[PDB]
Structure formats: C-alpha cells, structure tokens
Subunit: 225 residues, 4 copies
C-alpha cells in the first residue's frame, strides 16, 4: 500500500504550512501521516496553527498529536490537505470517500482558500471511475429510491456494509453509503446530477482541486491545471 | 388561514384514493386535514390502504387516525398528497418547507407515481419566491459556509431559530434550516445549483408535480401541465 | 461458526409464528437465518404477518425476503426473535450489541409480548461478561467522559473503530460505540447504572427475556427462568 | 420575564471565572447573559479562558462574543455555568430542558469540577415537578413505548411539538422530546429509573449541583449545601 511514498508526500506537504494558518485535516492513511507531521512540526517549532477536521478520525488524531482544533463554523481554512482514492491525470478530478467521510471532506476542501491533494503515485488514473465506484452519502429512508435513480443514470449501485457493525455502514453524519460504478463522461456535470437526486447528501466526485502532490520513487511531483 | 378551503380540498382529494393503494402522507395544515379524511375513509369503507409518511408529524397523525404505515424502502407510492407554501401559477412550481420537512417530502413526492399538491387559493403566486424564502436543509458543521455560498448567489439567507427549543431549528433528519430569499429566474436550475453547494442536503424548490388541487369558494379546481 | 446449529434453531423458531402476528426482526447471523425462514413461510403458507426491524440489517433482509414492515410507533410486537453474543446459563441474562445494534434491539425486544432469543450452543456461558465486553452506545461529544465513568466502575473501555468507514464505528442512530470489559456481579443493577452515565444512550446487557432457543447437536433446547 | 434579575446574577457569576479556566457554557436566557458577560471579561482583561458549549445556541453565542471554544472530548471543565427551569429550595435539585438541550447540558454540567446554576428568584420552588414537566430525550423509533413506560410509572407524558417546524421538536442530537408531569417522591431515583427506559437518552432531573446563584430584588444570593 505504498507507505514510503505516502510518508514522502506527507513530509513535503507539511512544508507548505505557515505560522498563523488554519489547516484542514483530511481523512485516510495519507492524511493521517500528514497530521502526524503537522503535529510534530507545530511542537518542534512552536507554531500557532489550528486544525479543522474532516472526520471523527482526523479529530481524534489531531488530539493525539496535540494540534489545537477549531471548527469551520468559526474559521475559514487557509490550506486543506486531503487524500484521494483516484486522481484523474489530465483533469485532476478525484474520487474520494473510500473511507466514508467524503461529505465533511468536501465541505472543508471546497471552502479552503487552497485545496491540496496528497497521494502516492498508484492513485493516478487515466479515466476517473473506471476502476473505483463513486461513494454517495444517502438519507436512510431514501436508500431504495436513490439506488433506483443511480441505476436509471446507468450506474451499478450497492449499499456499503459494515465489518464491525451489522448492516449498512453509517457515516459520521448518521447516513448510509451507496457505492456506484459509473462510466463518467463529464465529472462536473455528474457530481451536480447525483447531488440533485432526492435523498443524496453528497458524493465522492471532487472537481475543485488547486494542486496535487504525488509521491513517486523519484520524489514528489506537483500537478496543477 | 382559509380553513374552509383547506377542508374542501382535503375532502375532494380523498376521493382519489383507491383500495389497495400506498399513499404518501404530506405535512402541514392542509395535508393534516387530508390525513384525517383518509383515516375516516379507511375506517368507514374498510379499505386496505397503507401510508408512507413525509415527517414525524405525518407519522403521528397516521397513528391518530389509524392509517397503517409502511416504508418507501419497501413500497412505491401510488399517490402522494402534500401541501405547499407557494404554487407558481404558470409553471406549477412550488416552494415547500415552511414547516421544515421538505427533504423527506421531496424523497416521497418526487418518487410517487402521482404527486398531488393540496392548497387553498391563497397559495397561488404569480412569481415563485417573490414573497416566500426558500428553505434549505444544511449539515450543521456547514451552516456558515452555506450562508456564504447562498449570499454569493445573491440570496438573503438566515438560519431558522426555534421557540420550543433554544437555538437553531433542527429537522427530522438532525440538520439545520437556512431560509433564503432569492430572485428565482430559472427554478429548475436554481434547485440544482442549491443542492450542489457542499453541506446542503435538500431545498424547498419543487419542480416536479402531477397536479395541484386548489380549494376556492366555488369548489376545488385541478391544475395540471 | 456453527451454521448448522444456527439454521436448526431458526427452523424451529419460525414454527412459533402464527397468522396475523407482528414479529420483531432481530440482528446478526442467527437472526438473519430466521428472517429467511419467516419470509419463506409467509410466502409458502400465504400468511398475513408483519415485521418490525431492530436495525437497518433487519430492514434490508425483510425487503429481500418480502416481509412487510411496520413501525413500533404504531404496533406492538407479538413475538420478537433476536440473537445474542452471550447467554448466561443460570440467569438467562444476555450480552448483545456485538453487531452494534443493541439500542434498537432493546427497544423492540423488551417491549414485545414474548421475547425469544435464538442462539447456537457456543453462546452459553457460565459467567456473563467474563469473555465478552459490554457494548455501550455513546453520544459522540461524551465518549471521553463515558470512558472515565466506566473506568470508575472498574471497566476497561475502548472505542470501537471500523475499516469500512475510517474512525469510530457509528450506530444506526448516529452515535459511537464503546466496548467495556467488566466483572459483572449484578447484571440488572449494572445495566441500570451504565444507562445513568450522562452520554450513554443504551448498553448491551439484557436482563429481560421470555425464553432462549438453543441449537445443539442433539436438537433445539428451550431455556426459561 | 425577570431580565434585570437575570442580568445581575450573570454579572456576579462571571466574577467566579479565573484566568486559565475551561468553562461550561450553559443554555437559555440567563446563561446567554452570562456568555455575554464572559466574552466581555475575556476581551477586557485579556484572559486565556476557553468555553465548552452545551448547545448549538451556546456555540453560536460564544462565537459572537469571541470566546475560544474547545470540546469536552479534549478538555475537562473547571466550572460549568447553566440555567434551570425549577430549583427545589431545600435540596437544590433542578428541572432543566425547557429549552430542549438537557442532554448535552448534563454531559457538561455533571462532568465539571464545579457546577454553578444561575437563576432569578422566580425559578425557586417548594416541590420539584409540581408545576413543571420533566423533559425526556427519546430515540424517535421509541416514542410510543416510552410514552407507555412513563404512563405506567404514573406520569402524564406528551410529545413536545414545534412552532418553527411541523411536528415533534427535534433536539441538537436528532431525537424527540417528551415532557412528563410526575409526582416526584425521590428525585435521585426517578432520574435513574427514567434513564433506564429503553429509548430514553437522558432526562431533565438534575441532582448534582454545587451552588445556585439567585437574582433577587436585593441582590444575588448563593445557595449551597
Ligand atoms: Cl473518506
Ligand atoms: Cl414542510
Ligand atoms: Cl447487535
Ligand atoms: Cl434546555
């Protein structure tokens, strides 16, 4: 699972943090390494830096690494750092939500002044959604009719089931997750269309990325449109 | 308040129900009268009719009037009956969610085989949203950034505060409500764009309807197309 | 995982269902097998039987096996069937909530006219909670202070984390789960005390049951008192 | 409604705050005045004091008066300040939850090193629960069986309905509120018994106060012991 490349991008990403910044703390294994680096760098350099978490996980990690936490209802974010399940090469469109936290991730990431994605090179894809389903957070009363709508749109949609709870996985917001495989022609339009299905709260297509840091065997390349 | 006209429309609407149907049970004063009529009809004619609620209000009234409730996750709705805050005369577009329940309302109403709106004549308007704000259900962590997005779209947005609970009104789904006055040029497109703001769950613009029953002093008229 | 003994108990349990009943549908592998048997019986005998689910799992299985679902807010349950993580041999006290659904389970199971536990023989224990921790559903804001409370009570408490969603496991009600090992010397009082910790929603000690059906190699035995 | 008395208690209460403390920020009109006073004192004396909110209201007010906010999952509370609907004179037992926020209030207030209640003189009563119902926060699926349980206990239990939303008032936690009139013979035991009803999250009886500051025409008096 490319941990050395993940750590490499985390250590490079943390250099972008400046004293006085409010930083969005992403979710997933790559973000988690970044949160540890930020925690270290805050302590060792006596920085005044606050974090806004994108999940209970990010919140609990921040606490462990002693990053002061604030909320988006109180502060704007200077830079949001987050991972991705896929990054489309030519567009820098993402699929996120493998970890079931795409809703709070999007809220922070799209609202930050800058949104930086942190990935190892294996996340790069030629075609978004070819090999990874789109996560969709759904109001529980609407699961059947959202599966219908997604199926009408050409998707193969399945409810995400839990490993440590019986039945559907539940998000930090109390909703279910449907994962849907789609042939994505126009990712911007598809993101809009899925969100307009009654019962859909948010989906894992991200189309507003400022830049992508990619850990490779050679180093860290930056991608920007 | 037009109670006479509301009762008239409810009494006429209940005649559309056929034995064996699953009926969507709307929310608000007019839908409440309909639920009473439906319960009375089920009793007096011994119909086998089930209901699917759009709110905890609808669930409680169904209990009170002995309408057996099933779930949208198992059954499609033959006819959904619901109220509206505004019905635009030329388009039959609606604003709903004055009572805070537009999200579950839309899940039921848009998915019903037939969606029938029940209003008294006072709800008819020349221009949608000229005199009533659009309810928007919002993930609580996102309220500040959603207010910003709505303001940047030209809206006057205010968080709805409560009287029987201190602070923000909370929906049946656990979220907050922002009410936003907007100049609605293209209702179909605005509905879509509001839903694509991160942190927005659903909004009160409704642009799909089968027919609108309107209680007037001379009787109930049916609007369609 | 004793699938023969679980299937055996499910097949015997379904015989207790009578035409016209409302049946509580439990959660977990043994309950799932019962739900299938029930659906088969309803179909092959053309029974008029309704279900009330204890979880999103039970809801989905009821859909799959064509059991019409109603609500506890409208109907009482004739017989609730559910599984257990442990059944104490002398008292028939249980631990439930291994699958994270103990809160809704307890709501249904304690209120049913008859509550029937279904287990294979491996679930029988000499001492409740010696080898299995008590699940505790917790308001997220409270997890730290609940860990403290449970520790004061002599428990070793740990937040349940997931792998299909990053971070804490979230219940069907949107809360967290703390699992706590305790030396249980009065189950009835411990259940009551845990529930009086601020931030605790419900716990997995069950001290009310009508009978326990146990699948053994020599047949299904029935335990009571 | 005794506004000058509330103000005078708030002004006296704020003197109890010391630099470096973490303070619990209560809910309701009297607490809101306290929050204003605290915000003023933090700014004017350049205190390093943090607040932990007991509601979305308290969080919103803190932000408005620029009190830095932390969470109970991160920090313990030195002093929690909160209001009350009733304060029984001889015992200092309280009823809280008039504003629908008793659950988060109890989580903070019971966990504080010191819990201070702020009331005007009109909140003092001879007998707890004689003139005011006990708020009870209830899992929505359980409202009928919880009404039943409370009624079996001798209570007159009624669902609290909203005025700025249709149907049941919903808490910050996404649950319903049932208000129940009871003849309270043993408050400590009743608090425990109500909490052990399946589907009850928390109730408004509070039995653990350190002191009560009372606003009277003459001044502010401290009740303790
Ligand atoms: Cl995620
Ligand atoms: Cl509404
Ligand atoms: Cl479970
Ligand atoms: Cl309150």
């Amino acid at each position: 699972s490319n941990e050395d490349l993940k750590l490499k991008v985390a250590k490079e990403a943390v250099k972008l943090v400046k004293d006085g910044m409010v930083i969005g703390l992403g979710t997933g294994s790559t973000a988690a390494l970044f949160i540890r680096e930020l925690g270290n760098r805050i302590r060792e350099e006596e920085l005044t830096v606050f974090g806004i978490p994108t999940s209970f996980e990010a919140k609990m990690l921040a606490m462990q690494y002693e990053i002061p936490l604030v909320t988006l209802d109180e502060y704007d974010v200077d830079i949001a750092f987050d991972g991705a399940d896929e990054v489309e090469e030519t567009t820098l469109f993402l699929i996120k939500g493998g970890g079931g936290c795409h809703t709070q991730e999007k809220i922070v990431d799209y609202n930050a002044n800058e949104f930086v994605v942190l990935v190892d090179e294996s996340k790069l894809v030629k075609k978004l959604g070819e090999k990874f389903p789109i996560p969709v957070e759904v109001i529980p009363s609407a699961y059947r009719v959202v599966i219908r709508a997604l199926s009408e749109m050409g998707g193969e949609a399945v409810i995400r089931l839990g490993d440590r709870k019986r039945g559907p996985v539940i998000t930090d917001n109390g909703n279910m997750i449907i994962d849907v495989f789609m042939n994505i022609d126009d990712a911007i339009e598809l993101e809009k269309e899925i969100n307009n299905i009654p019962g859909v709260v948010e989906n894992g297509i991200f189309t507003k990325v400022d830049k992508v840091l990619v850990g490779t065997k050679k180093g860290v390349k930056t991608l920007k449109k």
